[PDB]
Design a protein around this nucleic acid. Structure first.
Lengths: 106, 155, 82, 137, 7, 52, 110
RNA sequence: AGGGCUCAAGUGAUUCACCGAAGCGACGAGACCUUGAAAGCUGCUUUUUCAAGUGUCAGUAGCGGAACGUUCUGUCAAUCG
């Protein structure tokens, strides 16, 4: 039952929070709610994580994040944030061309 | 003392980049935030927030430095020595006639993000209040602040 | 004239009358758009909640959508090859 | 089943044939194309895998041709597409159209007798990306 | 038939 | 004075959203007061979508 | 990667007892259709008297079918048929790669 | 809140962008209700498949529906060991 499928998750906890039950149930009853907060939280945690890259690797080429996205949305490059960040990460020359295209608005 | 001033660059990773911030003697905070970025490696694309890839940024000639208004004799630095009663306080004029390096070092320390890589970033920062530096033979990239200084003027 | 209204800014915190009135017309969740012939029963009725919904669009809303399609429609490819 | 056809194509794919044997899966890996599926993008080169979301009308050992392409990039060569397709093709293939994992939602209100427990799964299709065209190389 | 009965 | 209900200061980037809702309701009552008859006299596509 | 992967399957079941009624019905019902669709499988359909019924596949993937019903047991065979030999391990990252670039990865060089 | 802000990063007025929530969308999954279509129902009209829903699906007390298990006992002089 639950009495042992707790002692399945409990791996790694510190204290008597891993052997006994009346304590296991607590550090685990949190050990799920945190996972709920982060399967609602990573989707955003990562969002800002992306911009910082694009932000840096375009500010390197003059255009600031706002001008960049403005130019691109306005001249219809519906590429989106994840892959823009990956090209920022891994493709200096094509990304540079991107920044120039978005400078071809403002 | 070449030894006692050459710091602990025998401790970091060296193999990334050496960059030079020489304040021309203009302004604390606008030197500072620029530092707190460069000395946090958020300014290059390959950032990832669980690590230190802060580049070496080296500030020069903190004697020639400018802080506007008249805070100089008004904004002190306060610190508490634990012993009941005491609150050791020191104005910025005192601080600047003592060592105009500590000033900006402490300032960027406060600006940097409040996590335990902060000390482990300042381990990648060195200062001379001259233009004279022994970190020249290494690959030296002097740095330019953003081109974003309109500098509103007043009567 | 055919006004087209569309809920915005949310309905969680509001006077009960506005919630019922908003509900009576049919807007029942944020970012939803309904369509009615105005007839001075709707213009008034949904004037009580102009504060709640910023837009109570008329028959020229089609033009807004017409522009959107052009903004979202395809155009010839760009080649750089540095 | 032409509703299925149209639905796949508005999911940006199209299921071509099966495959007995053709000796694809070359190591030539110098090109990247930025292919989108159903609100989920991926930058790709030749041979990668991509997990997916129930690519609905396909099955084992099928070659899809995902009609969406955002940008093709060689060494410094950028056929910078605007989302619609300028005839570029992304020939890909399915293996392992199967589930992923159990994931636990369990909600509780700090002092209310309310301890709802639950379960959930999600099945996915590992597209082994194979081909791409419209490039310089 | 003794294991099929229902109501 | 016991429980500290802070006083948010009206700041330019909130003035932003103020003038936002202002121009929004402006359009709103504008097209309503246009509809004083069953006519269609409101120039096509007043912004309504830059609202952001 | 062109290959079949479910290299063998078993439907262990019973013949006396009301438990295995669902799998028994499944047997005559939809074994032949799936099998004629999938020759690559080695669907060895043995028995096991008196034991509660289950299925097995390629490693070892077991799926109980006690007190279940044919319309679902068909799906619970097509699951195994589509499956790999994987063990259930929550996804690491949605797009595995050994070559992430054509341009060089970012360094001090532009 | 601090760093620190007059070389505004302050105030009053005008303009663009951007960020930003479990909102709303994009795919995809379920549950109920609606909508059909088609069956079967004997009722000739309740009861299951499908499919369509910018349909719905925070919750204490409390209330209705459905489910898991456990000890025993008929199914069993059966069946496994």
């Amino acid at each position: 039952m639950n009495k042992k499928e707790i002692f399945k998750l409990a791996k790694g906890f510190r204290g008597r929070a891993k052997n006994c039950i009346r304590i296991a149930r607590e550090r685990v009853e949190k050990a799920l709610q945190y996972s709920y907060r982060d399967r609602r939280n990573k989707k955003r945690e990562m969002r800002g994580l992306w911009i910082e890259r694009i932000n840096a690797g375009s500010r390197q080429h003059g255009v600031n994040y706002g001008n960049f996205i403005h130019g691109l949305m306005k001249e219809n490059i519906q590429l989106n944030r994840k892959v823009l960040s990956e090209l920022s990460m891994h493709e200096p020359y094509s990304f540079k061309a991107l920044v120039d295209v978005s400078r071809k608005s403002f | 003392l070449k030894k006692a001033v050459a710091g602990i660059k025998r401790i970091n990773l060296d193999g990334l980049r050496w960059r030079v911030f020489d304040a021309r003697g203009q302004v604390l905070g606008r030197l500072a935030s620029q530092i707190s970025t460069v000395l946090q490696a958020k300014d290059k694309p390959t950032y990832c927030p669980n690590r230190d890839d802060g580049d070496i940024c080296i500030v020069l000639n903190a004697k020639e430095i400018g802080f506007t208004g008249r805070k100089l004799t008004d904004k002190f630095y306060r610190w508490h020595t634990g012993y009941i009663g005491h609150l050791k306080e020191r104005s910025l004029k005192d601080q600047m006639a003592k060592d105009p390096t500590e000033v900006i070092r402490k300032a960027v320390w406060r600006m940097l993000p409040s996590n335990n890589l902060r000390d482990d970033r300042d381990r990648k920062l060195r200062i001379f209040e001259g233009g004279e530096h022994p970190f020249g033979d290494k690959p030296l990239e002097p740095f330019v602040m953003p081109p974003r200084r309109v500098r509103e003027m007043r009567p | 004239q055919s006004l087209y209204i569309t809920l915005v800014r949310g309905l969680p915190g509001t006077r009960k009358l506005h919630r019922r009135t908003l509900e009576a017309m049919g807007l029942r969740r944020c970012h939803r758009t309904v369509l009615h012939s105005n007839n001075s029963s709707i213009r008034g009725m949904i004037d009580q909640v102009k504060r709640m919904v910023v837009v109570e669009t008329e028959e020229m809303y089609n033009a807004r959508k017409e522009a959107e399609a052009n903004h979202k429609a395809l155009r010839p490819p760009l080649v750089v090859s540095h | 089943a032409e509703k299925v056809e149209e639905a796949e194509e508005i999911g940006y794919k199209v299921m071509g044939p099966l495959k007995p044997s053709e000796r694809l899966f070359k190591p030539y890996e110098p090109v990247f194309a930025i292919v989108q599926i159903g609100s989920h993008q991926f930058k790709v080169s030749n041979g990668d895998s991509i997990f997916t979301e129930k690519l609905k009308f396909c099955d084992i050992n099928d070659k899809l041709e995902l009609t969406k392409v955002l940008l093709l990039g060689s060494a410094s060569q950028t056929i910078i597409g605007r989302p619609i397709l300028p005839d570029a093709t992304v020939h890909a293939v399915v293996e392992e159209h199967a589930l992923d994992e159990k994931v636990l939602i369990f909600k509780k209100k700090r002092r209310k007798n309310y301890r709802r427990t639950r379960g959930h799964r999600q099945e996915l299709t590992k597209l082994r990306i194979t081909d791409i065209q419209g490039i310089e190389k | 038939s003794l294991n099929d009965l229902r109501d | 004075g016991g429980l500290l209900w802070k006083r948010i200061k009206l700041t330019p980037t909130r003035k932003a959203n103020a003038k936002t809702r202002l121009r929004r309701v402006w359009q709103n009552e504008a097209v309503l007061r246009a509809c004083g008859e069953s006519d269609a006299p409101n120039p096509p596509g007043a912004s309504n979508t830059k609202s952001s | 990667r062109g290959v079949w992967q479910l290299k063998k399957l078993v439907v262990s079941y019973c013949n006396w007892g009301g438990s295995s009624r669902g799998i028994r019905a499944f047997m005559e019902s939809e074994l032949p259709a799936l099998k004629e669709k999938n020759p690559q499988l080695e669907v060895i359909t043995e028995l096991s008297r008196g034991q509660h019924p289950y299925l097995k596949g390629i490693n070892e993937r077991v799926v109980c079918v006690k007190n279940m019903d044919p319309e679902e047991v068909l799906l619970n065979a097509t699951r195994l048929r589509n499956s790999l030999g994987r063990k259930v391990v929550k996804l690491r990252t949605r797009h595995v790669t050994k070559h992430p670039s054509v341009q060089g990865t970012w360094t001090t060089a532009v």
